[PDB]
Amino acid sequence: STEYKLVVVGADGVGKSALTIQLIQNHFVDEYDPTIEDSYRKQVVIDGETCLLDILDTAGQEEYSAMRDQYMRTGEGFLCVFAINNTKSFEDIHHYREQIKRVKDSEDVPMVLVGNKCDLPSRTVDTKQAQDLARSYGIPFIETSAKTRQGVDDAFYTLVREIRKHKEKM
């Protein structure tokens, strides 16, 4: 069992809690308290390795949080989530990413850019701008849907893969 500390970040309403609960409990939450921050520890198999994912589902954008401070410093991977029907959530990505890098004091922080809510027809963030942004960062870009579970596993498994590549480089 190999441990992996992940932190799910992104604007309110992007689907962080829904993505996290889809991964851990295999159910879509239509409503979930936007205010609650919580951690989850689940055993999973990724590329033959039995992993233990310790995920922090962040909340409370405007307020202080000691748990999020501890997870931002010690976290190995960060799932940077935006919603494809929300250009402001996409525009906040660089802010979360640069905040993460500064708290980590490193330009080598494993991250995956997630474009959640790909099941919706009303779309505002073109796959091109998000792909170009991920390419500029040198990070993978996965489109997901917590509602249909599309790409949910691929998003967190890819983050674990980025952490392995970083861990073997150092």
Partner: peptide, 11 residues
């Protein structure tokens, strides 16, 4: 007070 915001209060 590490930004940008991002999370408020990350110091």
């Amino acid at each position: 007070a590490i930004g940008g915001f991002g999370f408020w209060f990350v110091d």
